Amino acid sequence: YYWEIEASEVMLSTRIGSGSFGTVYKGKWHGDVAVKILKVVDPTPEQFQAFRNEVAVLRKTRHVNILLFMGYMTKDNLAIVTQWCEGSSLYKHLHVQETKFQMFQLIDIARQTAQGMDYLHAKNIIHRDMKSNNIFLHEGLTVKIGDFGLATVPTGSVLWMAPEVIRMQDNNPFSFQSDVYSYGIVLYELMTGELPYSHINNRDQIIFMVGRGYASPDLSKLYKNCPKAMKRLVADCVKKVKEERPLFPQILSSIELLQHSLPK
C-alpha cells in the first residue's frame, strides 16, 4: 500500500512558490501533478519527521474537498505529490488579482471550505496553519485544502491566528476551535474582499494586539449583499473566547440551510 512513487518517474517543471518546509512545482506524473520538494541537500532529523508527518496525515485524506495526495518520494530529495489544479490560490483570486466573485457561489466557496473542514475534524485531523493561501481553487469550481505541513490528531502568517494561540500557552494551544477561528477569517475575507486589519501596517504590533484582546476584526465593513445569518456566523466563529465558538458539525449545517434562502 506504499504511496511512494518508484524512483524518478516524476518530472518537475518551474517553481510556483514556497510554503511549509518546501517548494512547489507543476511537474508531471501520469498527468499533471502539484509537487512539494525539499530543495535541501541533506535531511535534518527534525525535517525527516516533518516530512514523514505530513505523509501519514495525507494518507488519511480521501476526500473531494481535500487536496488529493497522490504519492511521495524520499529518493531524489524528499517530495510530496498531489493533484494539479487549474486556477490559483484563493488568496491570489481575492487580494493579488481582485476577482469579483458573485455572492451565489461566493458562499458556495465557504460551503466547500466547511465541507472539507468538517471531514478533517471528524477524522481527528487538525490543520493548524490554515490561511486562505491554502484554499487552492479547482477551475474556480471546486475547493480543495492543501499543504498539511502543520497538522496532527521560524516565520509565520499572523492574521489567521486565534488570539489564544498567538499568546502561546501550554504546549497545546492548537485545538479544534483554533482552526475554526482561522476559518472565520476566511469567511470574513470572502465577505470583505480583503485581509483583516488592513489599514494599519505593523505586523509586530498585531501579534500583541489581537493576542491580548484589542484588535478585533472590523465586521462593519463587508459587501452589502451579505446574509443576515452570515454576519452572525462570521461573528460566532471569530469569537475571542475559545469554547464559545461553534464546531464544524454545525457550521456547514447552519450554512447549507442559509444557502436555500438567498437565491431570492
Added chain:
Amino acid sequence: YYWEIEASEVMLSTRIGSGSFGTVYKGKWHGDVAVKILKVVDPTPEQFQAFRNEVAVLRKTRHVNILLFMGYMTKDNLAIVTQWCEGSSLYKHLHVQETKFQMFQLIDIARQTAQGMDYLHAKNIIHRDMKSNNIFLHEGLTVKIGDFGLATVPTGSVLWMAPEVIRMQDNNPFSFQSDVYSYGIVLYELMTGELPYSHINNRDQIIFMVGRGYASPDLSKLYKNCPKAMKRLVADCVKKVKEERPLFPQILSSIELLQHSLPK
C-alpha cells in the same frame, strides 16, 4: 486508516440504477457521495470475496481520473462510498441524452479516459469490465473511471469485449490489451455518437461474429471533424489480434501529441 465508515454515518437517497454487484445511490457523508450497497439481507461467501477484492483494488487508486474511493461499510448491508459527480455517465450523455460535444473537447474527454486508464495499467490494475456506462463525467469536465467490481490484480455487457475474451480460451483472456480494446470502442463511441453495429438487432449474433473475427466495427462512420491520426489510433486499438494492440503509455502520449495540432 481503515476506510471503514462507522455504521449509520452514511445516508442514502433515491436510486441511481444498478450494476457491478449492487445498487447505486446518491447519499450523504460529510457531503454528497455515490454509494454502492448490497441490498441483500444475507451476504454470500462468493460475494464476500467479491466485495473485499473490489475494496482492495480501490485502496490503491488515488487519482484525479479514478472515481475517488472514500470508504466502505460492512455493518448494515455491504457498502462502498465514493465521490459524487453532478452530471451523468457518458453512456447517457451520448446515447440517451445525445449531447453535442464539440471536437475541441471531445478528444479532451478521450485524453482523460486514457490519462486514467494508463495509471491503472501502470499500477498493476486490470479493469476487466470497461464500458462507456462506467465512464462517469464530472459535469462537463474531469473524466473519472467507474467501479472495479470485476477489475482484478450473470449479466454481460457485450460490445466492449475483445474477440479473444468473447471466445473464452484459457481462463485467462482478460489482459492489458483487453482493456485497451474496449477503450477503442469508447473512442469509436466518441467519434460516431452511435453504438457499435447499431444497425443490426441480434445480440447473440454479434457475440459470435465479433468472437470469430467476422464482424469488424465500422470505422467509416466517424464525423468529418475527426483527425486522420485519430482514425489510425482507433484502428490500432480495435485490432482483432491480441499482441498487435498498442499499450496505454503509448496511447496517451500519442493523443497528447495530436491534441495540440487541432486548435486551428
